[PDB]
Amino acid sequence: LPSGLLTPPQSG
Amino acid sequence: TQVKHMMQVIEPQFQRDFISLLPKELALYVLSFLEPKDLLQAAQTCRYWRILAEDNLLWREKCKEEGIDEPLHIKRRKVIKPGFIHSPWKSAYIRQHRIDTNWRRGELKSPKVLKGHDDHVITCLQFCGNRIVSGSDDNTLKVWSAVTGKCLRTLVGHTGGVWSSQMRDNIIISGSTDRTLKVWNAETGECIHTLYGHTSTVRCMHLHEKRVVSGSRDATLRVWDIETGQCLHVLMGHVAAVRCVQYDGRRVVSGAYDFMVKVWDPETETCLHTLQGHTNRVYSLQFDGIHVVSGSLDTSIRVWDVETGNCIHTLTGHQSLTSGMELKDNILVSGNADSTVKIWDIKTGQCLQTLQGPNKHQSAVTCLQFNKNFVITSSDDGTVKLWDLKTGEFIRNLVTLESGGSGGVVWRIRASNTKLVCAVGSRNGTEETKLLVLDFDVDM
């Protein structure tokens, strides 16, 4: 994923 | 009146000029054909002219021009000799001109630094008249004062990271990985509702009046009542995670990782339309009640007609993920991982400007804001840039993190007419996470 962008870590 | 009252008190007599001799009214009819830049020069001609150029009603209409709607009634006190009846509308117009000039070439006043969320990230930012709300994966949110600097409250309660947020004077709403949403009281900082229903991370949410719609990694959306704390409807139909959502009180629009955009009528929990076209995850959305605009990992941005489900434009040109978009009056601005920002006319589909050049961003554009004069962009390059919306030209770097090239990043920005709030930090330890508040207000 491009650097500077985010998302919560995978849950399951 | 007012202009008459001025002539009979200052007594500007004997002028051998055209307008000084014309009946008051006709001089005003004439001065009206001038643009503000001129009225301001004409006002420096002589006392008689100055008094005319200050006709309150001449400016009230010149403010509607720049969309002011509100005249400012300023600073009182021990007058300089020969008085002058200033025009509230004129000073209001000038205030804005100076503010615009401050943003454009002002002189960066070192910003208030608000330290918080240590070694963590800021996932969402909210700015509402003097109050700032930061959301983090440290499981908290912090309400700040854009005026002083101080943290006013820290909303502790979630057991997972906060990833979504919304606010409307004193009502804050958060969405966490702990699968719940929480309605808070910004002033007291107390949780007043905890909304259960989603089983997977609450990814996105859009608030409209007394209702909020949330999108989750469980492939569903839920519409809640911010007052009762009840879940009113559940939109089921998406196959993959719902990454973005828009709600106008009439229709719910959503984009998910199934390359689909769905238009819903919440009341009857029904999917009116499933918009097909994107060939990859849809990350961003915008909706003005008539057009739904979607941005995908597929490089394109699609413009659809909410009423028919028909695709109207397939905006091509970007090269990577369009992370953020802003729509306003059929003018769309998109921020993309290709480090570019684009300005489009969603009526014609024309790409009005591409913000690049020698001073373009070096990495992905993380956020953006815009108005009728400028576009403000943030990036992982550690800068926040100011661009001219009409010419598409670069103006200057509002923020330039010294650690920009080695980790420092600007995750998000919120701008009011008078100030800029930046969420800053880093994955390594080169930049302590914090908010930066720049002030572009003028002394008046």
Partner: protein
């Protein structure tokens, strides 16, 4: 048909109605008060003769721009005749022609064009420049 109107000078003008009715003032006196010869006390034969010329001819159009290539004294006259006669078209065009004389910035330059004396005192001018800064 054709109606007759008398300038302030005492000179009678014959003009096709409709051309004359472009002036609502004249229009009002003809259709409402019913003035056989329409007395125009605020307009003299000279200027009246000019407005008639402008009317019989009907973003500043190319012609009105030439037609108003007159000297200030006349323009000032036309502004008033138009206002008095109430001819929105003529009024706009002439007033606009004067405005364009200002569009160009510079206080000092606007004076050379309208004469005007800088009656501002040391402090006053300094203050005036501060307030209307751009």
């Amino acid at each position: 048909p054709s109606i007759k109107l008398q300038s302030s000078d005492g000179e009678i003008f014959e003009v096709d109605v409709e051309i004359a009715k472009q002036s609502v003032t004249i229009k009002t006196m003809l259709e409402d008060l019913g003035m056989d010869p329409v007395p125009l006390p605020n307009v003299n034969a000279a200027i009246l003769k000019k407005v008639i010329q402008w009317c019989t001819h009907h973003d500043i159009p190319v012609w009105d721009q030439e037609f108003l290539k007159v000297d200030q004294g006349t323009l000032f006259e036309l502004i008033l005749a138009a206002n008095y006669l109430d001819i929105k078209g003529l009024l706009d065009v002439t007033c606009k022609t004067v405005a364009n004389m200002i569009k160009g910035k510079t206080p000092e330059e606007i004076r050379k064009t309208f004469n005007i004396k800088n009656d501002f005192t040391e402090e006053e001018e300094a203050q005036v420049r501060k307030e209307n800064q751009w």
